[PDB]
């Protein structure tokens, strides 16, 4: 009940068991390469499906032969696309016309909202073609198919969820393409005539079928039967559904954008989409799995086309030339493996020509880069997957000792240099000084040698020895063990992961448990020193722990990438080693030191690019290498010394050697349930031989086992190259790619072409040197896939061309859907997922309304779909009829979708989030939005009815956990109803000593007492209470609950189903009825106020009256920015007045910078250019070397509580009970670490001192570089009455930048256009908040000193590292 089949595809596509189904139905199939599946006996739970009468009538009048899945893929897509409109009666519900109606209304609402906010009427006009009801049904080719597959996918999820009843099935009958769904399988059925299509034979029409039927007369099996069948799994169907939704979203967004602008829209035109979609479908159908080899080239080709846009230099076309040659090389291979004539394979050439010959701008190419997964994913074979890994991980390497020696010495030098610049002195050396003469007289004088002389005396660093650093018994997080992970089984029972019938024998022993969360709770002792002892004694080398197994990744287009799974205790060792490395020593290596150089200040560039220490010009150039191919190339001969040095640095021994000591002793295989090793038998089982699946003596690394150490070594070699070539380099590591930039200096009088050529020459020198340096380490850079360019860069997860950020909106907005992965198909889970995806999508583009339409469409679709097809209920249930006894109307759903979530509604698309993500106060902005929406809807009298609902029954702990919310039942999340069950199971199934000590018998009483105490001050401050609660052991307890929630048979563990059903009905009643929830007194009382701050204050006071007990609440309400400031336009150029259709004190002033630095392709749009500005840059006596998390949190609690209370008080007796629960220090010693205090205004200065803010506007970052914001003109607020006001001056900058960006998003600019306006302050919302202290009249009376045993909670020796 708690868990259901995944809503979206997240798993690899494996089709082994299909061969067993076909043999049990009397058909023929050859999906698998495993010879075990040709003659084994069928597992019973599959063999039993042949008895169903529905499946026998579905297979009536069919042939004995079947075909693979992809050869049909093309026809499947076309058939659903053209036939889905004749089956509307099947999905008569979902009310499509209402979906379109709601989306149109929402765009009109947002247009009115923005017209009022920006102060200009008629900024957004009416293209009556997009606004008609018939636009999307008539002009989008994927509309009806998308609706039909949403319906069918819900049915398929229901059928798979049931554990197999032999009568649960679904089917769909069309003009073509019948479907049938049974327990785990889906069967596709097509007429024979549509595949032959007037050809000589079946193989002649589809050459890819020669792999299954080499050259056989197939006509005896096809004359008497009208249909032919293909068997596949449930994942294939989910992938088809995903493909339709993605294509519909993409087409709709592009079409609306091209109607919006029609000169330049940052989206590929519809011609290109139609062509690419059709040709990709044909390529996949003709070449089956291989086709993905050709289709995999879409992304590099798009990148190589983007690169050809700057000042011409021949090198700019080399990458494109290389990609074209690779594409045809691939094609030539495929054409000889299948003996395809040249005239047959026109689709592949059309695919490449369509990409290249479309002359798009860089923005449209960057958007087209995002269609990589719009054709599906391939079928994986574990033998093909492991052939590559075996060849690469067993190969022999030729290494040069000199390169290895020098990079090791550089490693040691980097560590020593970071230590010196951090702590101002040499660490304590223990080696004889005579061995190193050059370093001796720098050590004696406590000076560090310069960068210029390090290379000459590089060898001397081999002899340096010193005292240990980075004590081991403390790690910062300690919550990484709790996280979910997949593990392997012990070596006694390694067969147990396979099927008994396929194996051919019954394994003697069966495994007890596998997942991490279920085995962390089972381990009885779990010390951290005991893991250290386990590693020190090399206990793992025992015969029980010598098992390792692979598994394949979900959604990629290659032949298969593997991630590894270890036994449980070796996994603990790996996690501890990587955490230790990431906290202590990985800090000396900057792997993200980059910023985009075109966006960096000239003085900083000059300072960084000077070799030693102005009339100089700095020009950069970058190249990109792939880090994925590093893992398998590492050998022990190379890494011995680095591992040993890490061991010495931590004082431990043999800890970091675990991978190289253990991996070569394991038996490498894939843990596929239906594909055991080809050759394993019963007597062969103890020492099995090598076969296609499995092998011995893996010699390299694995994808994620030692990522920190490998990245550190890579940084050391890059630094060695820097010493050799005497050029400044800056490297950045993304998830997979690492980009390196070389900086070069030129005189002032140099032609631009000369600089462009010389920068690339220097970058090429560096690239060649790095290629040699890594080649002598066994790691081969492949120069064929590497390019050197002057403008193209990856920096965040984004792409830049000459400093101009390019849009990537489709990547996140094409995955928008009605459902997400939540608990029991929760409606808020789905809507919240949509809302977050929307805010990111807007952050990555300049077109607003095309994405907004999609978000509103899918919101209404989610409501209807879950209304009548919920999985947690019987098949036809109609929640609304059960709940209100009558069907819901359009207006009720609309009003539910308008009410903000803080008030108990279902609105997760706040328009204010177009400006910035972090909103100071959600209640006031929600009230502002609701008032505007009701004024637009003309139902202005419903405001006080909708906001005034009956308060619920909530304790103090609920209010402490949700500081800024209301006491409404409808706004509460669903996890809060399961938490109590999870806790109960934890107190039943746990033997871990740490967990049993943390969740002791009387923890509930502690939670009740602490939450009641934190709200007992005379003026209550909820933010302070929440901040404090996060750092007590109760906060840790909540964190552990949050980690442990995402599990099975712990959250899950009849009556649980009934409980969930009743909760769902109650929530729907609360959401969709507003006359039921009313307080006539509250409405009568609210009716007098006019400012939104007064309304918010009254609501907060009234809602939590029982908790507050007459005291008054402070520190929660802040004004909405869009109501406090109004936009007044001062000067507009003459060319913009025609476009906006207009005819003619304290403030912030904003203007547009006239000077342009870069532009691509022209200056006609504001988002195509960058400038000079940078408005965001404007906005402790003791310190311990290694402070644990407990000490950090204790310091934060002491700081906050000291800052809140008054000086003339008795603070110490209040501080002891809290501090004794975390650390062992006395009161007085702690004060020695507090920073400077004694300045601030408590109510105002709490939000800005300790709050969490947004550092930038939620737009693309090109606009900020041309905005001139000046906050000096707002009078007495520029600390007189400024520290004592509501205004937050960091958010007005974001508002100014966002206004400038949003207003000019579609205007056509020129070289003579300029814009300046001002934000005017209003008097209604501004308040003068006097400085006020909190008075606690009674200290906490509860013994919180009970966790002296937990190292997760307590620090027994808080200060063992250096005092510094």
């Amino acid at each position: 009940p708690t868990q259901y089949p995944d809503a979206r595809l997240s798993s690899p596509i494996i089709l082994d068991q299909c061969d067993l189904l076909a043999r049990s139905l009397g058909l023929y199939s050859h999906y698998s390469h495993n010879p075990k599946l040709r003659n084994c006996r069928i597992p019973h739970h599959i063999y039993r499906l042949r008895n169903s009468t529905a499946l026998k009538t579905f297979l009536q009048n069919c042939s004995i032969l079947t075909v693979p899945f992809h050869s049909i893929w093309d026809h499947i897509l076309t058939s659903i696309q053209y036939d889905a409109i004749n089956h509307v009666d099947d999905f008569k519900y979902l009310l499509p016309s209402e979906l379109v109606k709601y989306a149109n209304w929402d765009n009109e609402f947002l247009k009115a909202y923005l017209n009022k906010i920006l102060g200009l009427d008629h900024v957004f006009s009416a293209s009556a073609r997009s606004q008609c009801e018939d636009f999307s049904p008539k002009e989008n080719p994927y509309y009806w198919g998308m609706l039909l597959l949403v319906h069918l996918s819900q049915l398929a999820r229901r059928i798979k969820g049931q554990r197999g009843s032999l009568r649960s099935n679904w089917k769909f009958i069309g003009t073509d393409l019948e479907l049938f769904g049974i327990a785990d399988f889906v069967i596709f059925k097509v007429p024979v005539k549509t595949i032959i299509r007037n050809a000589v034979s079946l193989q002649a029409s589809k050459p890819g079928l020669r792999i299954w039927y080499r050259d056989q007369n197939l006509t005896p099996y096809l004359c008497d039967d009208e249909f032919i069948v293909s068997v596949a799994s449930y994942e294939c169907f989910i992938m088809i559904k995903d493909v339709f939704i993605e294509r519909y979203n993409t087409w709709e967004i592009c079409a609306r954008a091209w109607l919006e602008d029609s000169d330049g829209a940052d989206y590929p035109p519809l011609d290109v989409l139609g062509e690419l979609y059709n040709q990709g479908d044909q390529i996949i159908a003709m070449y089956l799995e291989d086709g993905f080899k050709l289709i995999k080239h879409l992304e590099p080709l798009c990148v190589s086309c983007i690169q050809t846009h700057g000042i011409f230099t021949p090198r700019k076309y080399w990458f494109q030339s290389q990609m074209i040659k690779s594409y045809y090389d691939e094609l030539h291979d495929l054409n000889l493996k299948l003996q395809i004539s040249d005239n047959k394979a026109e689709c592949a050439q059309n695919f490449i020509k369509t990409i290249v010959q479309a002359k798009l701008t860089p923005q449209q190419y960057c958007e087209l880069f995002s269609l990589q997964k719009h054709w599906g994913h391939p079928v994986l074979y574990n033998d093909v997957a492991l052939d590559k890994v075996k060849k690469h991980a067993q190969s022999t390497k030729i290494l040069k000792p000199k390169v290895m020696f020098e990079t090791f010495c550089v490693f040691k030098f980097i560590v020593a240099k970071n230590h010196y610049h951090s702590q101002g002195s040499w660490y304590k050396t223990t080696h004889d000084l005579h061995l190193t003469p050059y370093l001796r007289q720098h050590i004696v004088s406590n000076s560090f040698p310069s960068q210029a002389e390090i290379y000459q005396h590089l060898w001397e660093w081999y002899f340096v020895e010193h005292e240990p650093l980075f004590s081991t018994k403390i790690i910062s997080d300690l919550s990484i063990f709790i996280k979910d992970r997949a593990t392997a089984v012990n070596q006694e029972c390694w067969d147990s992961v396979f099927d008994r019938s396929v194996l051919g024998y019954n394994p003697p022993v069966r495994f007890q448990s596998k997942r991490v969360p279920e085995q962390f709770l089972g381990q009885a002792d779990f010390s951290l020193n005991q893991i250290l002892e386990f590693a020190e004694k090399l206990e793992y080398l025992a015969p029980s722990y010598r098992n390792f197994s692979f598994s394949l990744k979900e959604k990629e287009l290659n032949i298969g990438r593997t991630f590894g799974k270890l036994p449980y205790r070796v996994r603990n060792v790996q996690t501890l080693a990587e955490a230790l490395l990431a906290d202590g020593l990985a800090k000396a290596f900057p792997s993200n030191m980059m910023v985009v150089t075109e966006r960096e200040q000239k003085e900083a560039l000059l300072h960084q690019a000077s070799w030693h220490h102005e009339n100089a010009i700095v020009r950069g150039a970058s190249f990109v290498t792939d880090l994925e191919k590093y893992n398998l190339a590492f050998r022990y001969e190379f890494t011995r010394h680095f591992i040993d040095y890490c061991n010495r640095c931590y004082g431990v021994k043999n800890l970091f050697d675990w991978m190289h000591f253990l991996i070569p002793l394991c038996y490498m295989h894939v843990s596929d349930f239906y594909s055991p090793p080809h050759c394993v038998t019963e007597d062969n089982r103890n020492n099995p031989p090598d076969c296609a699946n499995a092998y011995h003596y893996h010699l390299g690394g694995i994808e994620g086992l030692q990522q920190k150490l490998w990245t550190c070594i890579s940084c050391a070699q890059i630094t060695l190259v820097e010493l050799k070539t005497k050029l400044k380099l800056k490297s950045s590591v993304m998830g997979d790619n690492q980009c390196i930039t070389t900086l070069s200096l030129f005189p002032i009088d140099a032609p631009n072409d000369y600089q462009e050529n010389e920068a690339e020459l220097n970058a090429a020198r560096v690239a060649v040197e790095l290629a040699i340096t890594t080649g002598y380490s066994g790691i081969f850079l492949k120069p064929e896939e590497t390019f050197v360019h002057s403008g193209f860069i990856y920096f965040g997860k984004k792409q830049y061309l000459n400093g101009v950020q390019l849009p990537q909106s489709l990547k996140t907005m094409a995955r928008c859907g009605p459902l997400s992965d939540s608990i029991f198909d929760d409606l808020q889970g789905s809507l919240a997922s949509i809302g977050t995806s929307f805010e990111r999508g807007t952050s990555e583009t300049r077109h607003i309304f095309p994405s907004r339409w999609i978000a509103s469409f899918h919101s209404m679709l989610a409501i209807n779909l879950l209304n009548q097809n919920h999985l947690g209920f019987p098949l036809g249930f109609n929640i609304d009829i059960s709940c209100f006894k009558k069907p819901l109307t359009f207006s009720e759903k609309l009003i539910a979708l308008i009410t903000p979530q803080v008030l108990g509604g279902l609105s997760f698309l706040n328009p204010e989030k177009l400006f910035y993500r972090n909103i100071s106060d959600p209640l006031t902005s929600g009230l502002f939005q609701l008032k505007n929406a009701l004024e637009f809807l003309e139902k202005e009298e419903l405001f006080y009815i909708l906001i005034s609902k009956k308060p619920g029954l909530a304790d103090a702990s609920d209010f402490v956990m949700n500081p800024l919310g209301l006491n409404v039942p409808g706004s509460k999340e669903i996890i809060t109803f399961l938490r109590q069950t999870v806790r109960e199971n934890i107190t039943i199934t746990s033997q871990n000593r740490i967990i049993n000590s943390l969740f002791h018998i009387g923890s509930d009483l502690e939670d009740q007492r602490v939450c009641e105490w934190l709200l007992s001050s005379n003026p209550v401050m909820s933010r302070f209470a929440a901040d404090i609660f996060s750092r007590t052991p109760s906060g840790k307890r909540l964190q552990v609950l949050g980690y442990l929630e995402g599990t099975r048979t712990l959250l899950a563990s009849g009556t649980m189903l009934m409980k969930l059903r009743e909760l769902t009905r109650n929530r729907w009643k609360s959401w969709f009825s507003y006359i039921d929830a009313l307080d006539d007194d509250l409405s009568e009382s609210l009716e007098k106020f006019t400012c939104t701050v007064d309304v918010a204050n009254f609501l907060r006071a009234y809602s939590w009256s029982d908790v507050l007990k007459g005291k008054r609440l402070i520190g929660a309400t802040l004004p909405c920015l869009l109501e406090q400031f109004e936009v007044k336009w001062i000067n507009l150029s003459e060319d913009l007045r025609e476009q906006f259709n207009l005819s003619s004190l304290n403030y912030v002033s904003c203007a547009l910078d006239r000077k342009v630095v870069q532009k691509h392709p022209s200056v006609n749009r504001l988002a195509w250019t960058i400038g000079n500005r940078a408005p965001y840059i404007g906005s402790p006596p003791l310190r311990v070397n290694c402070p644990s998390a407990a000490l950090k949190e204790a310091i934060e609690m002491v700081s906050r509580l000291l800052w809140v209370t008054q000086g003339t008080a008795d603070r110490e007796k209040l501080l002891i009970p809290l501090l004794n629960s975390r650390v062992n220090l006395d009161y007085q010693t702690v004060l020695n670490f507090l920073p400077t205090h004694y300045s601030g205004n408590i109510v105002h200065r709490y939000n800005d001192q300790y709050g969490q803010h947004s550092f930038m506007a939620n737009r693309m970052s090109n606009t900020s570089t041309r905005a001139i914001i000046s906050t000096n003109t707002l009078g007495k607020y520029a600390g007189q009455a400024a520290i004592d006001s509501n205004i937050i001056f960091q958010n007005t900058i974001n508002l100014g930048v966002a206004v400038l960006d949003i207003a000019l998003s579609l205007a056509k600019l020129s070289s003579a256009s300029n814009v300046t306006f001002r934000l005017m302050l209003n008097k209604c919302c501004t308040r003068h908040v006097p400085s006020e202290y909190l008075y606690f009249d009674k200290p906490l009376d509860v013994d919180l000193n009970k966790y002296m045993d937990n190292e997760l909670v307590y620090d027994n020796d808080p200060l063992c590292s250096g005092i510094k």
């Binding site: 050809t308 011409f312 021949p314 076309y317 080399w318 990458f319 030339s321 290389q322 074209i324 040659k325 045809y328 050439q349 490449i352 020509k353 290249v356 010959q357 190969s395 022999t396 390497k397 030729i398 000792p401 000199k402 290895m404 020696f405 090791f408 061995l435 190193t436 003469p437 060898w459 081999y462 002899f463 001969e637 011995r640 010394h641 020459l761 090429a764 020198r765 690239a767 060649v768 290629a771 040699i772 080649g775 002598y776 081969f780 120069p783 064929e784 590497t786 390019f787 050197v788």
Partner: protein, 217 residues
């Protein structure tokens, strides 16, 4: 003798450090010269143990005395040798054969079986024979960057590029004039006295019966 002693001291320290690193890296299982040679001669493949070679070329020449057959060690050394050949003027420079170059030019052209496809084949073959393929490709890319299409680029290259001055068009054997592609039929003409490429004559079609047609673009 202070200088002649201090120099020896520093170098001895350096030599010590380097060789200590070497012995630690491969220690305790490395194959000596005699055992390596004996195993290689008697089995035909080198032992599964690490070994130390004088030069990269020595590793490239390690093969059984009786017969020269490639073994994993030789392949690893040859791979490394191709890496050493790299130079920084030609890093990632495309190396294209005549057929590959023709395929690229085809990728840049619109339509199918137009006269420009035949022109592309002829030009690619001629450029590759004279060893001037890289300059030809760079000139083509430059004309593309100026803002024109591939057809105008090809015509201008036919006029101006140095490798095509005073070159007679090649001769193509066909069964008849119905064998020539349909889009190119309308452009056929009569053979001029002295045809040449820089004047717009692509190739000469000679039928089975001695009839010759010259393609003009």
């Amino acid at each position: 003798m202070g200088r002649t002693l201090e120099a020896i001291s520093k170098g001895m320290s350096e030599m010590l450090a380097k060789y200590d690193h070497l012995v630690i890296s491969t220690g305790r299982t490395t194959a000596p010269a005699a055992a390596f040679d004996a195993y290689l001669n008697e089995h035909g493949v080198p032992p599964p143990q690490p070994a130390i070679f004088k030069d990269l070329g020595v590793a490239q020449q390690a093969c059984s005395k009786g017969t020269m057959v490639k073994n994993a060690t030789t392949d690893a050394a040859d791979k490394m040798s191709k890496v050493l050949e790299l130079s920084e003027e030609t890093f990632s420079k495309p190396n294209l054969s005549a057929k590959d170059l023709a395929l690229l030019l085809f990728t840049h052209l619109p339509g199918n079986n137009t006269p420009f496809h035949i022109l592309a084949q002829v030009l690619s073959k001629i450029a590759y024979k004279s060893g001037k393929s890289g300059a030809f490709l760079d000139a083509f890319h430059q004309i593309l960057s100026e803002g024109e299409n591939a057809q105008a680029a090809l015509t201008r290259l036919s006029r101006t590029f140095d490798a095509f001055l005073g070159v007679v068009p090649p001769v193509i054997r066909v069964k008849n004039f119905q064998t020539v592609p349909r889009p190119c039929q309308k452009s056929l003409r009569a053979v001029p006295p002295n045809p040449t490429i820089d004047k717009g004559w692509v190739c000469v079609y000679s039928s089975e019966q001695g009839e010759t047609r010259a393609l003009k673009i």
